[PDB]
RNA sequence: GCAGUCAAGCGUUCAUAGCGACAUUGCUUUUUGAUUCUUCGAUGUCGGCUCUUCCUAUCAUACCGAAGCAGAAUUCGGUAAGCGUUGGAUUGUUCACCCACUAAUAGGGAACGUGAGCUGGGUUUAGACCGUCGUGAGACAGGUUAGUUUUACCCUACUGAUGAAUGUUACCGCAAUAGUAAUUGAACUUAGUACGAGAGGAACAGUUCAUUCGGAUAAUUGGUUUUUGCGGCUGUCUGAUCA
């Protein structure tokens, strides 16, 4: 026969399979193209997602009707204790694809990073890197042996880094580890730059700047085993149906007599690896500061943490990237912010933003007040108070 | 001394611009071949102020004024308001007005010495309109329509009305204004006169599709072709 | 950025917070939240709801 | 859009599917309108075309002078009552749905409009702004 | 039902801009038939709803060639199935035809796709009414009304979820193979410019929004409320206040 009325599919065939993402930290499948004339710097940076909030700003976008007027916009705060470099790794191009020939580690590793190697930390003797930290007991001729094998070889150089999980309201204590390629020039200058930063720390403003357009890479919020209607967005069947009205009615023709990968079925929803692109950065925030959440017109000193703190997260005592829009994954997840993979114009990008106001009122209710100095101002003294 | 100008493709020039003996005001969109049409006849003499009123491109629709002052609706932002106070002279006094009826263009028509207002506007503002616009206030309707500012187009020399007007209505209302009134159409027969053209003593602009007989009528009653 | 007052409950209204209501005679009503926007749709009198601004203003609360 | 639409319009929440009946706010003599289609709407299996503030539709007059009845003619939505979102951040809605009756070029069959008019309507249709009293 | 070949001829002249009569040569299994090969120790029969996929014989969109194409417009062909193709009134209706939108509202296959997926309006039992016919029981190129819609827990397939053996154990990776997505429209400008006696009247670039699809996400707005979280109210019971 034929469909009798011809309509689009339900569901994107590019995001299949919808199985569970294989770690809470989402991989970075590709990094920006290498520019050898620029200084040496990292291509991505790790962070934890606090929440969202509200932003007023003047829109200057030539020709639009909303040109030169405030517009409210949603931003997500991703939180940043500075990252710290525990090693570097080289890769040699092979006809079967890139391959890591050697790894080189820092001398002194924190509790947090050594904890990543342990399922059972409390029963452990904590002996990881003990034999390795003794390869500095000489002049280093065994480790400088290996950094000389990277320089000679190694088309590309990636730098093992780790998050500082103890500046974060999270309860975890076990830091996340990761590799970040570096786009500065001269693979000889890459392993130099690394070897000089071992156990030093790197900060937001030395990777991402204002107004840049970056990628957000997280694992999706998991909703669990889910049925076809809310998973794939199908019509709900008429009231009168027998054996359930929330389903897909025809699972295929007689032939081919098999069910096809493209029909809609029920299973895992949420908790997938998803990369969203082109997110403008409204602020790159300072770790120790007051009036993180003030701005040139605002002038009242207040941080970006809402009254009562970000729901389910904490207080934001660290650096933060404050990025326009919404981001995959939910609160308290590890986010990986990547540099763009292509140049842009778009005139929406390349627009410089100046935040006119930031919303510090509470997210745990209907917030009437920005600062507790505002609440006590309006509401007057109470029976406790004075 | 009439002029044909088309804002974007629109033929209604009384919507987008408000023209008085002291100053001019124009919409902020599209091409300045619309904007050059004012200067070329005006020159460097009067100011010309690009603006938005309440974010809307309709400035002469939301604003009522003569050379002595301007009135702006409450929805006008203050980020826009100051811009209008500096670009205009300091002689012109803007005084914002809070009223039930938001668009002040349609509700009021006034030339330097006379104003006509929609009858339902409160007795508070007819006090204020006397102060800001500096005129006399008379509550009338031109041929049983409602909005006077849209359907009766005035200037100190003479003024125009929509074609539907009764002759006893024209001769009635001319003695009020002191200026000769003439019915007619514009924009190839559009009933709405005050939204299709803006005019002052030495300039008149109207939509590109106005017919040549119509244009002469505009030219004659506003004393355009000198003299 | 102008801050207005909710006309029922008196609260200050920050951007993107609440709804606006234009009644048949065009008079505009702003509401901080769904609570005061629901008590307005019930015809409740502001001056008899104990926690509103106009309430305390008649009962002479807290102005002292 | 097409004939009469000046500039573009920013999407607002669709409040009036095919079959809705709105007050007709002009003085042209119709008491109400009946939306039979929406100009420019998209086509998807099972959706109902849906109007919104400032749109141009196809209407008929159920209540009003019999001169105007039994005939499809275009109309414009001046009020919504389904709350939509401006970009200055507010949500707002009117007390009820309403509209005016127009020609394919957008001119107004009536000489006036009563009560408010949304300024997504008043800017997009220059004749509607010329007939308007309160604009929001 | 569809596609070629010769062109007697319509078209201002002009066979091939656009056609074709006479006929001839083929293709088509979405026509209707013919046969009676499989099935009567049963392959659940119409249509719609729902949903996936393939074909091209292209309706829209892309880029082209042509006109008896100035522009505008439309028309015929070329590669092309990547992506779309709708809301309804009447009818069981497939079909059809009307109303309005649309860039367009193309033609089909998959056991006339699809009832352990639905529905049960239609045909098609038993009840009943009418019309014609028959002496009658009863019959119908017929009209009408009422009429039980069973089963998965099995094997595969599909969708998700673990997992022994790879000396033990942890972390960081590579990327073979597989899948893959965006879409279309209008407004401002270019420009009342080009072409044009005029009437009329474009386009590349740039810009602001939008339609259908997709992926997320929940600051705000909305919905939801067993936070039975707080307040209000009814009947009754704990002797009442209180709870």
What are the E-state strand segments in chain A?
44-59, 69-80, 83-85, 87-92, 99-105, 156-162, 177-181, 201-202, 213-219, 224-226, 267-269, 273-285, 319-324, 334-338, 355-358
Q: Which domain holds residue A128?
A: 82-202
Strands D32-38, A273-285: pairing is unpaired
Distance of alpha carbon C45 from alpha carbon C24, whole angstroms: 19
Strand partners, A99: A92
**Distance of alpha carbon B33 from the chain centroid:** 21
Final residue before a domain boundary, out of A202, A229, A246: A202
Residue D2 belongs to a domain: no
Q: How many domains does chain D have?
A: 1
* Torsion sign (Cα): B150, B97, D77, B120: negative
Residue A265 belongs to a domain: no
Distance of alpha carbon B102 from alpha carbon D133, whole angstroms: 7
CATH number, position D118: 2.40.150.20
Nearest by CB: D116 against C17, C18, C26 = C26
Q: Which nucleotides of E are covered by protein (CB under 7 A)?
A: 48-54, 83-88, 99-105, 107-114, 116-120, 149-150, 157-162, 169-176, 179-181, 185-192, 206-223
The encoded tokens of residue A145 equal: 């042996």
The encoded tokens of residue A15 equal: 């995001």
Are residues A209 and A356 both part of a single domain? yes
Residue A192 belongs to a domain: yes
Residue D68 belongs to a domain: yes
Nearest Cα to C14, choosing from C6, C3, C22? Answer: C3
Which of A328-337 are b and which e, b meaning 16 or more Cβ less than 10 Å from the residue's Cβ? bbbbbbbbbb
Distance, in angstroms, between A7 CA and closest chain D CA?
Answer: 6
Q: What share of chain B is helix, strand, coil (3-state, %, to 5)?
A: 30, 25, 50
Which of A22-58 are b and which e, b meaning 16 or more Cβ less than 10 Å from the residue's Cβ? eeebbebeebeebeeeeebebbbbbbbbbbbbbbbbb
Nearest Cα to C2, choosing from C17, A124, D98? Answer: C17
Which method resolved this structure?
cryo-EM
Q: How many domains does chain A have?
A: 2
Measured at the CA of A256, the angle between CA A251 and CA A259, to 5 degrees, comes to 35
Are residues A195 and A210 both part of a single domain? no
Residue A97 belongs to a domain: yes
What is the SS3 assignment for D51? strand
Are residues A337 and A354 both part of a single domain? yes
Task: Let me know: does D27 contact B147? Beta carbons within 8 Å.
Answer: no
Task: Provide the H-helix boundaries in A6-71.
Answer: none
Residue A115 belongs to a domain: yes
The encoded tokens of residue A254 equal: 């007689």
Are residues A75 and A87 both part of a single domain? no
Residue D5 belongs to a domain: no
Residue D81 belongs to a domain: yes
The encoded tokens of residue A192 equal: 């130099």
Residue D8 belongs to a domain: no
Residue D127 belongs to a domain: yes
C-alpha distances out from residue B26 to C13, D13, D117, Å: 33, 31, 22
Question: Residues 305-344, chain A: which have Cβ under 7 A from strand E?
Answer: 311, 326-331
Residue A298 belongs to a domain: yes
Residue D6 belongs to a domain: no
Residue D4 belongs to a domain: no
* Torsion sign (Cα): A44, A50, A51, A55: negative
**Is A2 part of the contact surface with chain D (CB cutoff 8 Å)?**
no
Are residues A71 and A100 both part of a single domain? no
Is any atom of strand E within 7 angstroms of residue A120's beta carbon?
no
Are residues A111 and A75 both part of a single domain? no
Is any atom of strand E within 7 angstroms of residue A135's beta carbon?
no
Distance, in angstroms, between C16 CA and closest chain A CA?
Answer: 6
User: Which chain D residues touch B194 with a CB distance below 8 Å?
Assistant: 130
What are the E-state strand segments in chain D?
16-17, 21-24, 32-38, 50-51, 56-60, 73-79, 84-85, 91-94, 98-101
CATH number, position A116: 3.30.1430.10
Dihedral pair phi/psi, residue A79, rounded to 5°: -95, 145
Distance of alpha carbon D80 from alpha carbon A65, whole angstroms: 22
Q: Which domain holds residue D134?
A: 15-136
CB atoms closer than 10 angstroms to residue A166: 13
Nearest Cα to A165, choosing from A156, A153, A154, A178? Answer: A178
Residues 6+ away with beta carbon under 8 Å from B100: B121, B122, C25, C26, C27, D134
Are residues A71 and A111 both part of a single domain? no
What are the E-state strand segments in chain B?
2-4, 18-19, 24-26, 48-50, 64-66, 69-71, 93-94, 108-111, 114-117, 137-139, 152-153, 159-161, 181-183, 197-199, 204-206
Q: How many helices (H) and strands (E) does chain D have?
A: 2, 9
Measured at the CA of A103, the angle between CA A102 and CA A104, to 5 degrees, comes to 125
Nearest by CB: C15 against A357, A378, A380 = A357
Are residues A117 and A213 both part of a single domain? no
Dihedral pair phi/psi, residue C61, rounded to 5°: -90, 135
Are residues A183 and A66 both part of a single domain? no
Distance of alpha carbon D105 from alpha carbon D127, whole angstroms: 10
Residues 6+ away with beta carbon under 8 Å from A95: none
CB atoms closer than 10 angstroms to residue B189: 12
Is any atom of strand E within 7 angstroms of residue A264's beta carbon?
yes
Are residues A317 and A379 both part of a single domain? yes
Are residues A95 and A20 both part of a single domain? no
Final residue before a domain boundary, out of A202, A237, A261: A202
Are residues A280 and A149 both part of a single domain? no
């Amino acid at each position: 026969s034929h469909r009798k009325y011809e309509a689009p599919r339900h569901g994107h065939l590019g995001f299949l399979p919808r199985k569970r993402a294989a770690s809470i930290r989402a991989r970075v499948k590709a990094f920006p193209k290498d520019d050898r004339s620029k200084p040496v710097a990292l291509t991505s940076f790790l962070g934890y997602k606090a929440g969202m909030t509200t932003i007023v700003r003047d829109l200057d976008r030539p020709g639009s009707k909303f040109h030169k007027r405030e517009v409210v916009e949603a931003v997500t705060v991703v939180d940043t204790p500075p990252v710290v470099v525990v090693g570097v790794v080289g890769y040699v191009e092979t006809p079967r694809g890139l391959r890591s020939l050697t790894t080189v580690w820092a001398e002194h590793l924190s509790d947090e990073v050594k904890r990543r190697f342990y399922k059972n930390w409390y029963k452990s003797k904590k002996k990881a890197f003990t034999k390795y930290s003794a390869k500095y007991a000489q002049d280093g001729a065994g480790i400088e042996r290996e950094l000389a094998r990277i320089k000679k070889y190694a088309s590309v150089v990636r730098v093992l880094v780790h998050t500082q999980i103890r500046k974060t309201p999270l309860a975890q204590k076990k830091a996340h580890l990761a590799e970040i390629q570096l786009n500065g020039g001269s693979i000889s200058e890459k392993v130099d730059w690394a070897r000089e930063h071992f156990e030093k720390t790197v900060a937001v403003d030395s990777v991402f700047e204002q107004n840049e357009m970056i990628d957000a890479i997280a694992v999706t919020k998991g909703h669990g085993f889910e049925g076809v209607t809310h998973r794939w967005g199908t019509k709900k069947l008429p009231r009168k149906t027998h054996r359930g009205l929330r389903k897909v009615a025809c699972i295929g023709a007689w032939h081919p007599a098999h069910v096809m990968w493209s029909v809609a079925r029920a299973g895992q929803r949420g908790y997938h690896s998803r990369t969203s692109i082109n997110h403008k950065i409204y602020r790159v925030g300072k770790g120790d500061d007051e009036a993180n959440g003030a701005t040139s017109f605002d002038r009242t000193k207040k941080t970006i943490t809402p009254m009562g703190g970000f729901v389910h997260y904490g207080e934001i005592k660290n650096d933060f990237i404050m990025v326009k829009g919404c981001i995959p994954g939910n609160r308290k997840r590890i986010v990986t912010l990547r540099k763009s993979l292509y140049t842009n114009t778009s005139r929406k990008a390349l627009e410089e933003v100046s935040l006119k106001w930031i919303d510090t009122a509470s997210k745990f209710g209907k917030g009437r007040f920005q600062t507790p100095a505002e609440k006590h101002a309006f509401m007057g003294t109470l029976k406790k108070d004075l | 001394m009439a002029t044909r100008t088309q804002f974007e493709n629109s033929n209604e020039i009384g919507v987008f611009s408000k023209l008085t003996n002291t100053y001019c005001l124009v919409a902020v969109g599209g091409s300045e071949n619309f904007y050059s049409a004012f200067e070329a006849e005006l020159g460097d003499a009067i100011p010309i102020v690009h603006t938005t009123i309440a974010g809307t491109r309709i400035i002469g629709r939301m604003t009522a004024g003569n050379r002595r002052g301007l009135l702006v609706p409450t929805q006008t932002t203050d980020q826009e308001l100051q811009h209008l106070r500096n670009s205009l002279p300091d002689s012109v006094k803007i005084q914002r007005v809070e009223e039930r009826l938001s668009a002040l263009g349609n509700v009021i028509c006034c030339n330097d010495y006379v104003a006509l207002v929609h009858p339902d506007i409160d007795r508070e503002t007819e006090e204020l309109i006397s102060d800001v616009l500096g005129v006399e206030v008379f509550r009338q309707t031109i041929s049983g329509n409602i909005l006077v500012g849209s359907y009766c187009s005035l200037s100190n020399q003479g003024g125009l009305v929509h074609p539907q007007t009764s002759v006893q209505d024209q001769e009635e209302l001319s003695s009020l204004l002191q200026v000769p009134l003439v019915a007619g159409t514009v924009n190839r027969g559009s009933s709405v006169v005050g939204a299709g053209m803006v005019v002052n003593d030495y300039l008149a602009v109207t939509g590109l599709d106005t017919t040549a007989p119509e244009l002469s009528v505009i030219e004659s009653i506003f004393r355009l072709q000198d003299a | 950025m102008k801050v207005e007052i909710d006309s029922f409950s008196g609260a200050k209204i920050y951007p993107g917070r609440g709804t606006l209501f234009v009644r048949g005679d065009s008079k505009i009503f702003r509401f901080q939240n769904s609570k005061s926007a629901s008590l307005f749709k019930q015809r409740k009198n502001p001056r008899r709801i104990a926690w509103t601004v106009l309430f305390r203003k008649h009962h002479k609360k807290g102005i002292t | 859009s097409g004939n009469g639409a000046q500039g573009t319009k920013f999407r607002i929440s669709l409040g009036l599917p095919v079959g809705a009946i709105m007050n007709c706010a002009d003085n042209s003599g119709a008491r109400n309108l009946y939306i039979i289609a929406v100009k420019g709407s998209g086509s998807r299996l099972n959706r109902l075309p849906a109007a919104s503030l400032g749109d141009m539709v196809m209407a008929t007059v159920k209540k009003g002078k019999p001169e105007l009845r039994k005939k499809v003619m275009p109309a414009i939505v001046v009020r919504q009552a389904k709350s939509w979102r401006r970009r200055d951040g507010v949500f707002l809605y009117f007390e009820d749905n309403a509209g005016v009756i127009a020609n394919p070029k957008g001119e107004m069959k009536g000489s006036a409009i009563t009560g408010p008019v949304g300024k997504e309507c008043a800017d997009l249709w220059p004749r509607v702004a010329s007939n308007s009293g309160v604009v929001v």
